[PDB]
Amino acid sequence: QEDVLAKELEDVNKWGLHVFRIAELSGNRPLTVIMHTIFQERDLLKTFKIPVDTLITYLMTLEDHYHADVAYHNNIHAADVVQSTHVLLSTPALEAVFTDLEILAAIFASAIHDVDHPGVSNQFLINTNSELALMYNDSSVLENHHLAVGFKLLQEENCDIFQNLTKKQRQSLRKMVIDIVLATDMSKHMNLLADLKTMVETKKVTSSGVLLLDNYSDRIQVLQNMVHCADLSNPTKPLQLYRQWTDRIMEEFFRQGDRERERGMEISPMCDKHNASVEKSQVGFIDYIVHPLWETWADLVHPDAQDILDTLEDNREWYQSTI
């Protein structure tokens, strides 16, 4: 049974990994085994002198702090965004662009980017005068919390996976990780995409055809959009994967709408299980958000992402056909 899991983990470099199968085969540890597999694959334990027992201890604690009873924003989502970022990092247009530390920051940020998510939106937390929104002054409420939890767990017993980085390395990693996870706030998507478009239009490549990034502002912006694309990568995945992600977000949204009903609040878009249009909402989300984003990413790394974009377009056609 560990033979089969090891077999499935040979796909870790491929888009459309069977992440739900890996979650089952690993005893509901997809985030630990996928992260561990990726750190080995990239030689990160050697490079940053990470004790393997420390890595496993932190990963299992981090994975524990995802809510097993949240339908979408759980440890499987975290594992999938981690793995999708890992693939995006390997794209030919980006070869040798990012340091080992920046690669570690992007992968770590993906792993923690939704930890302790309660299954309700920032807006719900603001409108219900939650303790989280009160702590964070209504501003990137969840994303600040994911960061705070993800860093705090490094301080538990035998959990500091960055114990052997230099002070300058830790300081630089911490800042990049914060910059990246804060960029997953969906209210920042339009400004983030507007900036990605500007970069594509003024794109510079090196003598080898690889993307040329002169400065932190450009490097972090690329990693911010990279993790944001991985976060919004479900509709680009093979359809059997995508449909299960849609089932899960809809279950999670419906539970929030029930709570909104239970309080006499207006029910949020897509949260009313009595007046739902699942297919129309996926087509809408692709047309106004996901495809504009992925088409701009595809341009930045052209033609590396052509197959991903073709799948997205087919999946949109399929959902559209069911209306």
Ligand X SMILES: COc1c(OCC2CC2)cc2oc3cc4c(c(OCc5ccncc5)c3c(=O)c2c1CC=C(C)C)C=CC(C)(C)O4
- Structural contact between residues 115 and 144, judged by C-beta atoms closer than 8 angstroms: no
Q: Which one of residues 80, 114, 116, 160 is an interface residue with Mg ion (CB under 5 A)?
A: 114
Classify residue 90 as left (phi > 0), alpha (psi -120 to 50) or beta. Answer: alpha
| Residue 235 interacts with which of a copy of itself, ligand X, Zn ion, none, CB < 5 to 8 Å by class | ligand X
Residues within the annotated binding site for 3',5'-cyclic AMP?
73, 282, 285
Residue 266 burial (CB count, 10 A): 12
| Interior angle at CA 100, CA 147 and CA 237, nearest 5 | 65
**73 is annotated as an active-site residue:** yes
Question: Does 191 help bind a copy of itself (rule: CB under 8 A)?
Answer: no
Nearer to a copy of itself, 140 or 315 (CB): 140
Nearest to 194 by CA among 101, 293, 281, 262: 293
> N- to C-terminal Cα distance for the chain?
41
Residues 6 or more apart in contact with residue 51 via CB below 8 angstroms? 45, 163
- Three-state secondary-structure class, residue 205: strand
Q: Which one of residues 100, 134, 205, 288 is an interface residue with ligand X (CB under 6 A)?
A: 288
Shortest Å, Cβ 292 to ligand X? 10
- Three-state secondary-structure class, residue 211: strand
Question: Does 80 help bind Zn ion (rule: CB under 5 A)?
Answer: no
Phi/psi at 89 (5° precision): -65, -30
Q: Which one of residues 22, 70, 147, 270 is an interface residue with a copy of itself (CB under 8 A)?
A: 147
Q: Which residues make beta-bridge pairs with 211?
A: 205
Q: Strand ranges (DSSP E) for 112-182?
A: none
Residue matched to tokens 């970069």: 199
Q: Which one of residues 58, 136, 162, 294 is an interface residue with a copy of itself (CB under 8 A)?
A: 136
Shortest Å, Cβ 246 to Zn ion? 15
Q: How far apart are CA 84 and CA 95, in angstroms?
A: 17
Q: Which residues make beta-bridge pairs with 205?
A: 211
Residue 176 in tokens: 């990049």
Q: Which one of residues 63, 160, 231, 260 is an interface residue with Zn ion (CB under 5 A)?
A: 231
Shortest Å, Cβ 69 to Zn ion? 17
Site string for Mg ion, 179-198 (x = CB under 5 A): -----x--------------
Which is the catalytic residue, given 18, 65, 73, 117? 73
Question: Does 189 help bind ligand X (rule: CB under 6 A)?
Answer: yes
| Residue 289 interacts with which of a copy of itself, Mg ion, ligand X, none, CB < 5 to 8 Å by class | ligand X
Q: Tell me the window of 60-68, 137-145, 183-191, 273-281 that interacts with a copy of itself (CB under 8 A).
A: 137-145
Nearer to ligand X, 57 or 233 (CB): 233
- Whether omega before 235 lies within 30 degrees of 0, making that bond cis, reads no
| Residue 102 interacts with which of a copy of itself, ligand X, Mg ion, none, CB < 5 to 8 Å by class | none
Q: Which one of residues 114, 160, 252, 260 is an interface residue with Zn ion (CB under 5 A)?
A: 114
Q: What amino acid positions are annotated as catalytic residues?
A: 73
Name the site residues for Zn ion (rule: CB under 5 A): 114, 231
